[PDB]
Design an enzyme around this catalytic site. Structure first.
Site, PDB file in Angstrom:
ATOM      1  N   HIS A   1     -10.606  -9.696  20.161  1.00 57.16           N
ATOM      2  CA  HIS A   1      -9.579  -8.955  20.326  1.00 57.16           C
ATOM      3  C   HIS A   1      -9.569  -7.850  21.264  1.00 57.16           C
ATOM      4  O   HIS A   1      -9.587  -6.657  21.106  1.00 57.16           O
ATOM      5  CB  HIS A   1      -9.164  -8.239  18.834  1.00 57.16           C
ATOM      6  CG  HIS A   1      -8.624  -9.240  18.012  1.00 57.16           C
ATOM      7  ND1 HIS A   1      -8.151  -8.963  16.839  1.00 57.16           N
ATOM      8  CD2 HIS A   1      -8.719 -10.517  17.749  1.00 57.16           C
ATOM      9  CE1 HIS A   1      -8.176  -9.925  15.909  1.00 57.16           C
ATOM     10  NE2 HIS A   1      -8.321 -11.122  16.426  1.00 57.16           N
TER      11      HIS A   1
ATOM     12  N   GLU B   1       3.145 -15.388  17.977  1.00 56.95           N
ATOM     13  CA  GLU B   1       4.504 -14.902  18.369  1.00 56.95           C
ATOM     14  C   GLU B   1       4.697 -14.697  19.933  1.00 56.95           C
ATOM     15  O   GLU B   1       3.840 -14.357  20.473  1.00 56.95           O
ATOM     16  CB  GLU B   1       5.122 -13.929  17.424  1.00 56.95           C
ATOM     17  CG  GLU B   1       4.051 -12.699  17.522  1.00 56.95           C
ATOM     18  CD  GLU B   1       4.590 -11.584  16.795  1.00 56.95           C
ATOM     19  OE1 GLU B   1       4.787 -11.536  15.705  1.00 56.95           O
ATOM     20  OE2 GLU B   1       4.757 -10.204  17.336  1.00 56.95           O
TER      21      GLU B   1
HETATM   22 CA   LIG Z   1       4.711  -8.884  15.040  1.00 60.91          CA
END
Ligand SMILES: [Ca+2]
Ligand SMILES: [Ca+2]
Ligand SMILES: [Cl-]
Ligand SMILES: [Cl-]
Lengths: 333, 327
Positions: B116, B208
């Site tokens: 990350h 997303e």
């Molecule tokens: Ca989100």
């Protein structure tokens, strides 16, 4: 924003473009010359005798679907030898040149004034040859199934009426007819997703009314109203246009590019972008935007193998202002 | 349908592409090499020291807005020397080579596991530098305005917090922050017509695509998926069964998203207007090349994509990890 770059200029009314598999490009000049642009050089692919008066001469151009295996280049031309009429001919491809092979369809209406000769030809997703024709200023021809004028025709690459055509069995009707009721249609474009055929055509000009040029969604057997209807109507017998300009926008060809429908403008001197919303059989224009302007009259418009949009200028067709290097092939993005 | 052709192969995790105005192409390889592919030849433009473990190393790449007059190439990288952290460094462009100029932004969170680290950088239509950062698997950082992790940052080309940034006059907030509440965000693309910024990011599934607005809080890790809490911005598109995305780009009217575990390029057909966008349908535009990470439109109009089969999570094949060109 689309960026323009000149591919080649000095042409006299480049009516249609054809992209050769090897990179070359064929350009049909209305005066009767098919030019070959390759590696920065312009040459003559073929010279054809044509009747170049009014809006007539050497107009539509299209390569055989299986080119070059089937070495054939199709062209729509107005000819005077042996009688004045429009026809679709085929040339045999010899590499850097082409030579007349034979007439594919003869007898399309033409008149001495050379107006309303239609002329756009192209092979569709079904592999068939589509041909647009004008009613040569004799408006009633468009509604006459016995006349090849004011129609959109569909043929096999060999020139025979396409199987499945709408009027194949009717007596007194030309089996080549795909759609009727068209004034002077010069555009042909197929929606990449649905396969639906769209066409553009010139509306009336002090010829029963001004403006109302249009874009139509062509369906087999469809009657598009000319000269019974101008613009939209409440008569179900005649199909309304997908879009029309009540203030006139005389169109050249049209093409699907990046999800939108682009329409070359001749008198409007601009390339318009039509934003569509809908689905097969149910389309409508959300908005119209100007994609190109400042180059004069625009006639041909096609998406090249490179994914770029090609457009040609028409400033030298007798209805514009001719400037140095005029009548170019432009490449957008 | 799109048609593909390979540009070059034999690369090791080509994370980002930069198109040189003269015609060349710079390619950032995660192990720490910036390659130059020009006139059919592959060479090393620069070799940078990086911490290449986990998902870290040499990641985002972007030319100065006024390149080459402003001869500068920006790169996002994880470094261990002098302390472990992520940073945006600038290199001076010298033609076929690029050398270290100065660090533009230092101190972005990084951890030994190397996960990350975000890494996507790009200059927007406003001429400012946008930077995505991850929360290094310490999720709370994303909601912390005092942390540079789990954010999208916006700076001037010189590294100063961009004028007009959302938290400039906010005590206890890094002025560089543009948006927060990200988990791992490695995607930046601007809508050609509206200039709106769109971003992609990885979640547990719950991957997303987001429409990024100034000061927007994208919920991680308080909320995942859609809802209607004014404090949090809902994703433009959410993947229920989970596509881990790479970068995204607007091409020929649509939004394309590279898929890493999904091994495909997806086309998102949009409908709506500025501020109110929705996904009409999702289609597959490319597959059969494995994991796909970078996706950018070139100056020639074609859409470029890179494979990421050598990043430790894919199947490596001869010549693997190429740059592909679509129509
Ligand atoms: Ca989100
Ligand atoms: Ca009509
Ligand atoms: Cl004409
Ligand atoms: Cl990653």
């Amino acid at each position: 924003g689309l960026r323009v770059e000149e591919v080649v200029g000095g042409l006299e009314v480049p009516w249609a473009l054809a992209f050769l598999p090897d990179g070359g490009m064929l350009i049909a000049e209305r005066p009767g010359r098919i030019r070959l642009f390759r590696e920065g050089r312009l040459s003559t692919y073929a010279e054809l005798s044509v009747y170049h008066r009014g809006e007539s001469g050497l107009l539509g151009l299209a390569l055989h679907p299986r080119f070059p295996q089937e070495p054939y280049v199709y062209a729509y031309r107005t000819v005077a030898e042996g009688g004045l009429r429009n026809q679709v001919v085929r040339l045999r491809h010899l590499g850097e040149r082409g030579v007349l092979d034979r007439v594919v369809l003869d007898g399309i209406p033409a008149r001495p004034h050379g107006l309303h000769s239609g002329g756009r030809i192209a092979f569709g997703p079904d592999g068939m040859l589509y041909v647009t024709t004008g009613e040569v200023y004799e408006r009633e021809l468009a509604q006459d199934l016995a006349s090849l004028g004011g129609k959109i025709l569909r043929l096999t690459p060999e020139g025979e009426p396409a199987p499945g055509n709408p009027f194949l069995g009717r007596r007194g009707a030309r089996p080549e007819v795909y759609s009727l009721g068209h004034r002077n249609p010069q555009g042909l474009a197929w929606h990449p997703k649905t396969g639906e055929l769209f066409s553009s055509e010139h509306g009336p000009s002090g010829e029963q009314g001004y403006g109302h040029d249009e874009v139509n969604l062509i369906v087999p057997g469809g009657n598009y109203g000319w000269p019974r209807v101008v613009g939209r109507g409440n008569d179900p017998r005649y199909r309304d246009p997908l879009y029309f300009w009540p203030q006139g926008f005389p169109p050249g060809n049209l093409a699907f590019f990046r999800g939108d429908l682009y329409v070359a403008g001749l008198r409007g001197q601009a390339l318009l972008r039509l934003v569509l919303e809908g689905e097969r059989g149910r389309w409508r224009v959300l908005r119209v935007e100007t994609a190109l302007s400042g180059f004069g009259r625009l006639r041909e418009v096609q998406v090249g193998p490179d994914g770029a949009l090609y457009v040609t200028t028409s400033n030298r067709d007798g209805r514009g202002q001719v400037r140095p290097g005029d009548d170019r092939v432009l490449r957008l993005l």
